[PDB]
Design a protein around this motif. Structure first.
Motif: not given
Ligand SMILES: *CC(=O)Nc1ccc(NC(=O)C*)cc1
Lengths: 17, 116
Positions: B2-5, B24-27, B98-101, B103-105
């Motif tokens: 899980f990567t946040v960009t 941005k985060f993966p969906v 800070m995003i948790s979905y 995973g978290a990043d």
């Protein structure tokens, strides 16, 4: 990690308000 | 995993403008709002607490009340977009989504504020 973030967000809210 | 960009990692904005900073985060397909947690912070100020599909504004730092909000409708696209209206000199500093979905990043963004 979201636990830790909510721990800190709540800690500051106590301080501010 | 899980990567946040972040599109850019530094925003230079003029005083009194509105700024939109993005993470941005993966969906994969649709969006599990139950799963989604978003937190925006800058310096020692609580900006945004969004978790398990619900907003929390009482925790928000008073300097951002009604001045800062998370742009929801992009989240279904994997974008946690913090907009701040009427930027002040004191809005300059280092921000962090800070995003948790699942995973978290998190990532850091620097904001610079001019004046004219
Ligand atoms: C881990 C954690 O959440 N700790 C925590 C949360 C909230 C508060 N709130 C106040 O003291 C008002 C303290 C510790």
């Amino acid at each position: 990690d979201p636990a830790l973030w909510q721990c800190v967000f709540a800690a500051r809210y106590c301080y501010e308000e | 995993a899980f990567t946040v960009t972040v599109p850019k990692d530094l925003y230079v904005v003029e005083y009194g403008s509105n700024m939109t900073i993005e993470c941005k985060f993966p969906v994969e397909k649709q969006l599990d709002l139950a799963a989604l947690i978003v937190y925006w912070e800058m310096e020692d100020k609580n900006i945004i607490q969004f978790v398990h599909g619900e907003e929390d504004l009482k925790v928000q730092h008073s300097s951002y009340r009604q001045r800062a909000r998370l742009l929801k409708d992009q989240l279904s696209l994997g974008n946690a977009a913090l907009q701040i209206t009427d930027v002040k000199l004191q809005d300059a500093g280092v921000y962090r989504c800070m995003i948790s979905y699942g995973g978290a990043d998190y990532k850091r963004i620097t904001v610079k504020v001019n004046a004219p």
